[PDB]
Design a protein around this ligand. Sequence first.
Ligand code: MG
Ligand code: ZN
Ligand code: ZN
Ligand code: ZN
Lengths: 189, 295, 177, 209, 50, 149, 50, 186, 97, 92, 298, 99, 107
Amino acid sequence: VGASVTSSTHEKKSRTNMAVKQGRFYLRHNTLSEDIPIVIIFKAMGVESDQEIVQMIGTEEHVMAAFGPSLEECQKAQIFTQMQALKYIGNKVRRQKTKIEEARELLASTILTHVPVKEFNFRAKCIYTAVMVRRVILAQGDNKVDDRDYYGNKRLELAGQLLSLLFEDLFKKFNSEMKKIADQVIPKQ
Amino acid sequence: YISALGMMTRISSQFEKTRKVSGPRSLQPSQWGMLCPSDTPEGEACGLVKNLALMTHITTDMEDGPIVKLASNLGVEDVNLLCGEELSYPNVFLVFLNGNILGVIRDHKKLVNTFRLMRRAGYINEFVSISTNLTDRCVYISSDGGRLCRPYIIVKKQKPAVTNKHMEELAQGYRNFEDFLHESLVEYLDVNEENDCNIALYEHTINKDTTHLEIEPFTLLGVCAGLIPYPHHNQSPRNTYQCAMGKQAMGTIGYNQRNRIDTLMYLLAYPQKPMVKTKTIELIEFEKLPAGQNA
Amino acid sequence: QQKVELEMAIDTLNPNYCRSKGEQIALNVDGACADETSTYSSKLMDKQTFCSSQTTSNTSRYAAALYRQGELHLTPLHGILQLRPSFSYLDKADAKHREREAEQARQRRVQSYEFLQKKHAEEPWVHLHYYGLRDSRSEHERQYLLCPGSSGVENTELVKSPSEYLMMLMPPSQEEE
Amino acid sequence: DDEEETYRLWKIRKTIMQLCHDRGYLVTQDELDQTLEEFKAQSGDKPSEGRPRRTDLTVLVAHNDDPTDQMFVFFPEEPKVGIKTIKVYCQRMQEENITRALIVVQQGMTPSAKQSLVDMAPKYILEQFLQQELLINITEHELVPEHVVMTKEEVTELLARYKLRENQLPRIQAGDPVARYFGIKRGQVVKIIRPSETAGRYITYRLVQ
Amino acid sequence: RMTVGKLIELLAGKAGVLDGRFHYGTAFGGSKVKDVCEDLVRHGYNYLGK
Amino acid sequence: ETLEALILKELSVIRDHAGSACLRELDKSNSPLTMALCGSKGSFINISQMIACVGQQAISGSRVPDGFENRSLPHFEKHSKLPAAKGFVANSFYSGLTPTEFFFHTMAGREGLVDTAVKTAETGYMQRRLVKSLEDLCSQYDLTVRSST
Amino acid sequence: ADFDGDEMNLHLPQTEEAKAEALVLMGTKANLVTPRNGEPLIAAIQDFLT
Amino acid sequence: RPEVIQSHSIFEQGPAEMMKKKGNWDKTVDVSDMGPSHIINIKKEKRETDEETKQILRMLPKDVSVAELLRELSLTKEEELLFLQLPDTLPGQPPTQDIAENACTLADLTEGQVGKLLIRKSGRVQLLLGKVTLDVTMGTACSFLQELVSVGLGDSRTGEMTVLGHVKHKLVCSPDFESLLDHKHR
Amino acid sequence: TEGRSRDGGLRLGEMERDCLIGYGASMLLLERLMISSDAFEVDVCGQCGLLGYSGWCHYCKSSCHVSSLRIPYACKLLFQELQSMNIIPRLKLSKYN
Amino acid sequence: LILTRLLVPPLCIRPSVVNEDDLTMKLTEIIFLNDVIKKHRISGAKTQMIMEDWDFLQLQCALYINSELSGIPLNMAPKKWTRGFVQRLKGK
Amino acid sequence: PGTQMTLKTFHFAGVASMNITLGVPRIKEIINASKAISTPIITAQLDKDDDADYARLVKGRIEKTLLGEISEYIEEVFLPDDCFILVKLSLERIRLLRLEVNAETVRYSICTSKLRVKPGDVAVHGEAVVCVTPRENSKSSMYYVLQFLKEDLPKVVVQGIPEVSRAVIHIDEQSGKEKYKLLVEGDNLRAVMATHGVKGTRTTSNNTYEVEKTLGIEAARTTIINEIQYTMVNHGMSIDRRHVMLLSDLMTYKGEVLGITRFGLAKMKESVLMLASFEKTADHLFDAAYFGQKDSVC
Amino acid sequence: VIGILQMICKTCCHIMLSQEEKKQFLDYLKRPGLTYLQKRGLKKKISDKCRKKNICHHCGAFNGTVKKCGLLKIIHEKYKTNKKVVDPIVSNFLQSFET
Amino acid sequence: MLLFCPGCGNGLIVEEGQRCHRFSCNTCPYVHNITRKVTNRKYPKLKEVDDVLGGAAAWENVDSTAESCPKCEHPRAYFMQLQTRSADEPMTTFYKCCNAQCGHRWR
Ligand SMILES: [Mg+2]
Ligand SMILES: [Zn+2]
Ligand SMILES: [Zn+2]
Ligand SMILES: [Zn+2]
């Protein structure tokens, strides 16, 4: 089983994914070198105590028993503080203060983009990720796997919808070409 | 005429014939009332090209302000104030808005009913939908556009809201359809919202729990499928074959057909109108431009 | 930008305090013999710290209510804060270990974190005295919740009829067409 | 317990000796209908039976053509046979001056000895099996037809009849379980008699490769 | 193929032509065969079109 | 599944008995009956469906699965197992279907169209591979069959 | 084939050898039984059975 | 590693299991209460479920506003603190604040009596407030520690801080929308 | 050519080939697939094993070791392409007996 | 087995208008790159870009046979599909 | 006929169970001769069928069981000096279940790939209770490695031979003689046939590859013919036996079961041009050039 | 290319084999009716039986492993350090980078 | 089942460094030496034991009573039951008959 959301807005279309490959939960994203244990992400997010993380996930015996093995690997590593996890993420970044601030801005403005954060208060993203984790873990109890065909999840485009993007693209390119010409002419010619 | 008209109501698909999965080709119950069960192409494209029903609407983006303004008053608690433990209780429901978390609420029934009543009165736009999911204890509110709708007649305590006096008034011209909308006599329903309703089909099937009623069941079938007489007496594939072959019958194209110069055009000398006709034939004025003859 | 830093004493004589572990931690975090500016006075940790996080910018709609027999006394809140224990001493230990080991473009500094850190650092610190709940000072201060006055008074405000209230809390969608 | 181990011992003795008889070596008929109670009579109970010796047999010889040719059957006890053990059997073998031998392992035998079991000597060859396989004689199985190995004269007459070169015949893998059962080597042809659904019969031949 | 709808169409059209009526074959509705039989029989034809 | 099996057995019994009762009254010189008896077109199942009662509409060898949450359409109560709420059709093609029966019937029917559309690939590819593999074998004058070599 | 608008191709061999092979091996009269199991395929059809 | 084992399936004794397990776990050494081995029973570890912080011992229930206040006044009559939430704007208007239609909030109201709280038959509650009524309902249950504190900035250099008490419950006030619609038809 | 806008010509698909194999008619499919599609005549040098032109092999400059052959054009095109990719299909050929 | 010359296919297997066939385009770009590297090495410029030109010729000659190769780095990855020899031998 | 295939329903032996692959996918599975197939089936006979003796305990001994419900409860036994793991067993429930498990047999079962725990670490305190002593491993392990050693009740790795699950009804109608059978959903013919108390000489598997590997090539071809005929007659269609005989003989005349795929046809054949004419063209031609192979035209 | 490059010695340029193995393989190639599938099989066999030797018996010069290092780029591991005693051949190569 | 340190809120571990074992944190010096019992576990996991007794294993389990078939009733199938998954879930039973050429086996 796994979970994913295609967070897309007016600015860009992106995606994320979660895996349960071995028994512990990992977060996967194409921009990062490889997947990371979710507890590292939680500690990087701004919550430290393991009690609070388990509280966010749940308190029922089976849900926590299954979430159990997702934190001993974090315990094995020396990640107990926020900047430890930030350092670890900055170590695991891929490119097409880098060690800390780059990781912070990446995690703030690219992970689950549709969830807003303005003053670096990360509680909302914490809650959203926690509920997603609970969703995926409880999905194993009963095989009611979501069916993509259900017509509540379909949306229809139209002529005036499509044409708007095309006009926006053309207008932006027009302005850019004019900008280039204006820059080229005045200082030299 | 039908070949031209039916194209304006055709839906494509983004799967674009990539491979076989035995998935989105099949007919689902979720298409009730929105897409034509019969008018689908025969052959390799079967199921992947679809046509709209007769009584259907598409929504568009909304204000998004008053919804949150009202939600903050119905008693939804901010998520930042409380810790994550509360989500595990069996009596608290998440509230979303276009998938974005908005708060947590106790006793969701009051919230849902008040929201629906407020929308009916006229303080929330008629295309905003609110629905409940008991399995996950969530409440979804959607306001973006692109999702289908259908109007239904509201039912309360086993009597339809509309009455013969309203129909007499409409016939005389005292009122119009939007008057029915404003007086809380009919309302639109989305696919997600009608998951929570009990849509009585005919008046004589109304019972304690029914909450809406069908204006006209014959509008399930689309434009091209409304030419068949007695579609419900035929085995199903024959209706699809007729839907496919009605777009090719020779006939008349329009009154200006004698002035067009087009690559290829077929006409019939002495067309005749049908002797047994549907009501969709009268809606689209097919009898003025017939294609065929009585034998 | 209301925030607090609260310092909490920790018992050391009690057996559940692992003295060896505490000495190791103090050595890892504090100078071996410097002691001029030390997080702890002794060779073991004597205190632990808490930090606050603000919850919501606007708190006008929240109020603190004091119950009493036959009457309720309300008071607006000046803020709400969330307190957690702080693990910064591990960071301090790591920093000590590391120090033992060894025509400008358009501005975008507004969105940077260290900008906000600097802006917060602009504000000078304030130190507070403390009194516990056991102190009678608490009961003395408790008197201020009970506002005096006649039990039965017709308030001058609250003249709006329900129609006006509904208009007020549901403003028209469009101010002008 | 202490009967099921002896039950397995009795069954594998029956099957191995059926194999010996089919190969043509010397065997006595009275021993063929040996009963399980007869096995208990000739050998004690499990606590009184020592696996590595209590089933050893070498009396069988190729009496059909050369009574002087004798065969060895050995029964290791350890789950995986080691190099030192096979060395012990090989040195006892050299003491007795025979050419070929047979081994039955309980579970397996080590990769080093796996490699060693193919290059001990051109003059010597050793046969390896597992208890699980020998627990039933496949030649009695329903699906398996009758295989018959045939002499050089018969194969010469065969490929003189149909006018073949010997390498055009259909092939049977050298590692096939039935090939192992009959122990035939490369270059031999086996007649097969496939039973028709009717009283008739079909005859085909396969070449070992 | 079981297209009984064609049989009903033929009968209804025969009934309608003889007295100027246009009949309806609307989905889940339309003219019923029971009345069409009497429409046929009033004009001197067999009540089932044979 | 015990309940499902019992329901299916009883619905099949209903359709079979209705068909038999229909055929017993049917007179000779009946055209469907003549066509069915000589086998030139049709069969008794089509006759019984046209006259007496169409059957349980089954999808993939089972009753119609729910498309909404715990029900098939909003016109039926939640957690209903009644015969009609899972595709059973009590109406023959003579008397006509109701809207829900019409929808379930079309839902069951489209499966055949999709299956026929899909079938064009697998069997053709399998026959391609098989005929490529088996092409060379021939019967010789020795009564043998030999490969190309 | 079913005469619902179907189409069929036709070839004319251009040799005596091809003619003879087609006539003797592909003749319709020589192919009255299918080779899968030896059952007839060319026999009467609907409306010749009635 | 043994291979020949005689299986057993005849019935055995239960109390035999109990006695053997007793012998394997009832030889307690709890008397080892040395100075370094002492524990404060208050300082025990905690269950994650704050309501069930009873993992090792020494050897929330459904509620409604009317019943909660009834308990608060009949069984006990000591002072208590409550944390309640109010609608965005109160039914009043600014007290000559010179005015946009700025929201009327408790922070901008004068002291004195402001309204009445009503309990009616069948157990539902309203806050009669001027000419309107606000329904009252229970909020989400609370289990973590909350403390009510008053921060006195006595001087620009320093002040003082005194604890008042701990909160236990929440209340939510919401306008009665359908009542407003019924009064003022639309 | 392929269409009906241009004058056409129907196709002997990959399945009609197998049908004709099944009948066992060996000259008929030869006539269908070579004689009346692209029967082309080339000349091949047996000394070097690859084809020349006009009875002269430029690879050897000898006209005394060249013979004519009848071959479908598509096969000749295949040989040209293959030799272009540095896959050389050298030929051996003998008398027709 | 390592190539230093290429046979240019005859005209007849690449008609006048594909104007001209894409194999002709590939051949012309190869010879253009050859002339570039020759004259530039004779000029006596920097080594690394010489080796870069050699790599670019490597890649183009490789593409001339197969137009499907995928490991191409982004900054010179082809923008439009083209037919090599195998693309016109292989496939339906 | 494969194109004539209609994929009819109610092929589940008349009981709507054992959803074994049937139809064109079944023919594909048989023809490709893939080493691993879906829903393998094995059958066996014992001596007799119905009521009193010797039959169904064989099913009990062979088919699926976990460590599972034999323990009515599992709970900690911590104590000051040290801690260790306890296993309770329900021997009366086992008696009704009548499997030969006992404290000693399960004690033997432990230490099989269970991190080299010594027999001293695991002890039989009573005939119904068994206990295990945890130990530090030092490979990123500590005394609290208890969380890791929680590897006993439903799923890590187990005693016995895995891969034999279960089977359910498939009834008959002929009462002239009375005849029943055993169905095994597993992938091990050798173990099932070699085991005691079952008539080994009449155990057949529908996995052709397993049969070939265990009983030889002749049984393999016989099973291929039988499976083809079974599927063909089950769907309700006819084909002469000689065709399937020829197909099975072609598949198994090289000494191994060579499926009809690109690999199998490559192994069966040698002509370069034909191979390039079917599949994998460019690689075939380049390799042929590399070897300098000369090809005839036959 | 990389295949045949994985067999040749980079100093003497011959094959890595022993004389009797050469004799055995030549006799293996000698048998009549050599088949194409036999050729592929013995290709794999020769690859396996030749890749093992780190030195060949005519010169004894050590040759390392040949591995693809990039897209149409092939590298050899002769001058490669090892966890064991430092190879004499690579020691001089390492020392030669002073300038 | 899990515990958290009240001092700092983290998962604790068990270790021995003195005369008695103790429940200890690792970021704060909190120690709680254990001296009594606890009576709950994580429900461990070991896989499906199917063929450990396959065929006719130790005959000590010979039993007398058995059921009978509703159709045929020859003398050979004594009874059996087994278990489904784990500690606290039900135990299934199947009744199976076998002579040859069928597929009978009931649940
Ligand atoms: Mg047709
Ligand atoms: Zn030449
Ligand atoms: Zn050398
Ligand atoms: Zn801690």
